[model samples]
Target chain A: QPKLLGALPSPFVYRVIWALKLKAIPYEFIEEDLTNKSPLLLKYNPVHKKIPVFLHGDKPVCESMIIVEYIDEVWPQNPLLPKDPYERALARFWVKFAEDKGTAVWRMFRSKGEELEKTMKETQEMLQTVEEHGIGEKKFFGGESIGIADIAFGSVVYWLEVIEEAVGEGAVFEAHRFPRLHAWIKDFKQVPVIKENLPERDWMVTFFKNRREA
Target chain B: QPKLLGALPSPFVYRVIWALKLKAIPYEFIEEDLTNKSPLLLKYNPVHKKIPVFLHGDKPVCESMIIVEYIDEVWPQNPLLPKDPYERALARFWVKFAEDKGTAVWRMFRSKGEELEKTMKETQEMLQTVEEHGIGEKKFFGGESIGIADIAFGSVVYWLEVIEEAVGEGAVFEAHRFPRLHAWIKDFKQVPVIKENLPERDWMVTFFKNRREA
Candidate 1:
């Protein structure tokens, strides 16, 4: 049996959860309070010392997207990646984009005035790039079904919305500006697994709100 | 036939070159001067406007590591990734480490004074993690051959050594402190494909030195 160690309201961990749920892989979920590091998480992933460590038997797999890829490779059930290498490479390209550029929305949550301007501009740029190049009228990232890139970006867009509500900041992902990405968010969340498994919103708002207040 | 657009003295680009050479996949290398962004680069990769974009047919694959994976999948000679899913996950784990923590050495090159203390500490810690968990008793990242993790860390370690010489900064990966990583470095660069294709050291030293001088 596969075992997963994770924390709530973490976009990274959420990626793993969604991957497991999407694939219909039965796994034991071991939730961790990241505020207090667990010896298990440290043992499993000594380098990062963070959550979303997927243990297949005694062996642990770290990193969210990598973990998702592992699940996709292992099960081969609901395929998260495309069959061809070039197609897989293109899918991974957006996953990389999500990993690198999603920091904009995150930075907005923790920052104040001038920083907000910087984060907002980049946040809109992220939205623009996705709207123009990434989504472009597709139902999900790859159209019809959710795939690796969608799972990767889904949490980022979700958290951005959550953070917007938590802090009541200036709207970065407005509907008019990013209709494609906007449509993606709706379609992504509508998935039964994703909609069901998302972190409790009220608690998340309180958690992010505390961080901003701090 | 595959085409690779790349820049001189970039570790990321070198990764793609090494992968192509290691697999003996014939590719036409299109060198890009990053000082002046070309329309071709912008058209292929408008999002990042970066080089090391692997063009298989008309489709452009971005990100160095992803490009390497694509080459591995397409060619399948001298396989870079291990066969097992678990083994692949372990290899990818270290690759992620190289991508994220290798920034420490880079941060060292561009800063000074107190920042050196900060950078050196993390740089050694990166060395420590790799020495203990990543390299251990192996000659390379995976035993007996160069693999994905090896290629990833090999470039980072080389760039770190280059930056150290270029800036006359602290020696973070000292032989005494990290003999295992030190040994792995020697073995990694000894590969004919890697040794032959590495960027000219004198030019790189001058380039990084210029960044420090700025």
Candidate 2:
């Protein structure tokens, strides 16, 4: 069994947990206090010094999406990536996209005045792009079953809602505006593994609310 | 044969070119004017509207490292990624590191006064981290041969020199400061494919110098 070092309320850490559960891989979870990080956390991930480090034996893998990919490859039971090369490339593209463009949601949560407005607009545009180009009629980003791309964007969708609630904003992900993403989020949360493994919604709301107030 | 739409003197574009060359794959290069992008370029890459859009059988792939991964997967001649899953994960982790941190070099190039000083400090710190943790006794980023991470960082190394020349700076990557990276740059450039395929230094200097002046 591997060990995961992460904190709750982090969508990145959630990505790893969800991937592990989807594969039915048993792992020990070690929670880290971000304010005062553990020595092990600093030692393992010296570069980024961020959370969601996956440990296989003694080797530590940092970066949430990278850890998710590592989990999918090492387990190989319920494959998260597509078998075909092009399909895999497409999945990787969206994963990169999510990592790159999903910052707007966090920015909106942290910003005020014009900055908040700009980030909200950017967040809406990102969601609109995903709705229009990323998912058309497919059940998931990988088609049919959930895959890496789904996990990547699923975290973004969930966290966006949490941030929206914490900030008391309702127009960010209007269902009528992003009908496809709204449907995709519903489908994603319906999965047994994801539904069971998600962090408590109330905890997230409180945590982010405190963060916003702080 | 595939088609690569990219602008000259772009390290991102050069990453794809170097990967294709290393794999012995023939590709048609279509240079795009950055100021006035072609309709085909815009059509192919509607998201970022960026260069280094790779086309295979009319299908488009954007993002530099993503395109390099696509080339490695599609060609599979001189394998750019490791065969073992663990090694591949490490390779990917470094590739992402290069992509994420290497921007400091460009930020240093584009800023001035206090902003330039801050970015230069950040760029130097990024180089130091790579020198200390990213590489050890390995000849390249992926052990014996040049791999995806090498290509990714190599572009940064090459562009750093060009930018340094354009701005008349000499101390950013002094040989003694980052000896490992200094040696690695030499080893990377010695590879026949990389040596032959680099953009002209004088041309890059003139191009960036002109852009700065304009």
Candidate 3:
């Protein structure tokens, strides 16, 4: 069986786990401490040595989003992507946007003081784009069914909400400010696989609460 | 015939130009000044509105690396990627690595003072990783021939030297420090398609020189 080497609380690893579960591809999950990384993890991902390393038949695939794509390509079961060329391109486009543009949300959680405000502004801008341009009449980013883009952006929607509460300041991602994305968060989390597999809400709240206090 | 909208100084655009030349895919290069972006350019790439947009049969594809992949996928002459799924994933891993990690070198060129010091350190670290773990003592990133990773990083090897010269810093691409990369630069420039299609060395030097001053 394929094994996933990762840490808990990593949205990157969650991307992989969600893909596997969504596709109904069973795999072993090995939790690794970032402070004390496993030698096997290092061997598998020598270049970066970071988590979400997907080992299929002993061949290691590193990087979170890339691993998710690899899984979708190889499994080809519960399709996480559109087969049509233009739609595939659009899906990949949104996935890339999720990674590149969504950094600010993480930045907001990790930062403090004026830097936090700066990151919050960037967060607002990213969500504004999503609210204005990304979601429309469709229930998900890939229309009705959940796709890779949904999984990619879903991590942010869930994680950032926890961070927003932890930070204790009204900003981007607030229900009043971003009603569409707020709606997206609700709709995305309602999916069965996602609803069941999400990292525990209390666990995340406790983790971030300690993190912010620390 | 496809038309490529790009900026002359961009390494990203040159990757597409090189891929087309290698594949013998004829294309028109429409220069886009980023400071004064054309409406057509915005229409073509609404998400990013950046250059290196490849228009094939009236459909516009943006992003330099993705465009290169699309070209390789659509027109499979002189195969730029490995046929095997594992090998293709590996190549893409490095391509993503080069895309993410390779920015330090560019930052080194654009920055000055304390920022330059930090970026210089990052540039050296990135080169060290490439030297120790990336190439595997191969002729190119794809073992024997230039593939997507090579195209992705080849732009950096060629253009970074110009930026280094323009910035009056040889520290980033020093021969003894990065003998493999330096040698690879020689090998890369010798490739006939790469040789013929490289942005004019003098022109790049002058362009970046003017920009640094401006």
Candidate 4:
């Protein structure tokens, strides 16, 4: 049986959670402690000493996006990545974008003063890029159904509002500015797997708010 | 024919060059000027506006490692990624490690004063993790042959000394302390494709030193 070692309220871990749930892969979710590291988490992921370590039998796969890709290949049902090389490359490109650039939201959460002002614009620009170039008219990044790109950007799209509210930014990801992404998020959440598997809003705000205070 | 837009002395671009050559895949190398951004580059990779962008027909793949994977998938001649799911996951895990942690080398190059001290340690620790956990006793990252993991760490491994010399950091990645990495680098460079395609050492030194002066 596959085992996933992770903590909730973590967008990275949640990406994997959504991944496995979508694939219908039966696995143990070993809820890890974020404050105090577990022996299991450390053993599996000694290099990073972090969570979202997916253990398929004895083999442990670290990194959230990599874990998602692993689940996509191992099960192959409800295919996450496209088979066509160009399509696959494009999907992977956006996945890289999510991993690379979407962290402006987190930077906004963790920072303040002049940093917050700059981070706010960065977050907005990140949204603008997605709004204009990324989502377009598609319901999800991969069109009608969710795929790897959707899974990659899932955290940034869903969790941004929570962080914005946590930091009292007041709807900076303004719906009117990102109609395509707004409509897409609604469809994304409507999916049974994502709907059932989203992290709690109250807990997320409290967690993020406390981290800011700290 | 596929075209590769790149600048010399960049380890990221060199990785794709190595990947293509290993498979004996023919491609046009479009040498890009780093000082002035080209319209073609901006058009193809508008998000990052960076190189090396690998254009296979119409599809322009961005990001260094992703481009490597795309080439590996499309050609499949010398087979950069392993066929087994678990092995591929493991290969990808190390690749992510190289991508995430290996940037310390560049940061060290870009910063100085008190910042250089902290950056230096970070670079060492990054190298230590690879030496202890990643490379292990293998000749290359994947054992016996150059694979995706090697390609991912290509820049950090090959380019470290160039910057160290450029800034008078003086052999911080010393040979005796990292015997396995030392052995691995030798084996890595000895690969016929790598040996032939390496950027000019003096040019790298001059380029990096000039950037440091700037």
Fnat of each prediction, in sequence: 0.89, 0.66, 0.24, 0.76
Model 2, runs deviating above 4 Å:
none
* Tens digits of per-residue lDDT for model 2, A118-194: 99999999998898889858899988999898999999989998898888764889888888899999999999999
Candidate 1 C-alpha lDDT tens digits along B1-214: 8888987788999999999899888889898988887788999998888888888899999889988888888888898999999989989888888988998988888778888888889888888988888975657776679999999999999999888888684666788888878788888888899888888778889998887898
Please state the CAPRI-style docking class of candidate 1: high
Interface RMSD (one decimal) of model 4: 0.9
TM-score of 3: 0.95
Docking class of 3: medium
Q: List runs of model 1 lying over 4 Å from the truth.
A: none
Top candidate (TM-score) = 2
Give a tens-digit lDDT track for model 3, residues B1-214: 8999997778889889989998999878898999899988988887678888999888887878878887887888889888777788888888887888778878877898989889878877888888887786789987788999999889977877898888886578788888888788789888999999888888888898898877
Cα deviation at B153, candidate 1, in Å, is: 0.8
Query: What TM-score would every model get versus the actual structure?
Result: 0.96, 0.97, 0.95, 0.97
Each prediction's number of clashing residue pairs: 0, 0, 0, 0
DockQ metric for all predictions:
0.85, 0.76, 0.52, 0.80
lDDT of 3 by residue, A54-127 (tens): 99997999988888888988998888887666566667777778888888878888798999989988888888
Ranking by lDDT: 2, 1, 4, 3
Candidate 3 backbone collisions, by pair: none
Writing each residue's lDDT as its tens digit, candidate 2 over B1-214 gives: 7999997788999999999889888889998998899999889888888989999987899999989988888888899999988889899999998888888888877887888888888888999899999987989988899999999999998899888877766478888889899999999999999999988889988999898776
DockQ for model 1 equals 0.85
Ranking by DockQ: 1, 4, 2, 3
* Stretches of candidate 3 exceeding 4 Å from the true structure: none
The local distance difference test score of model 4 is 0.86
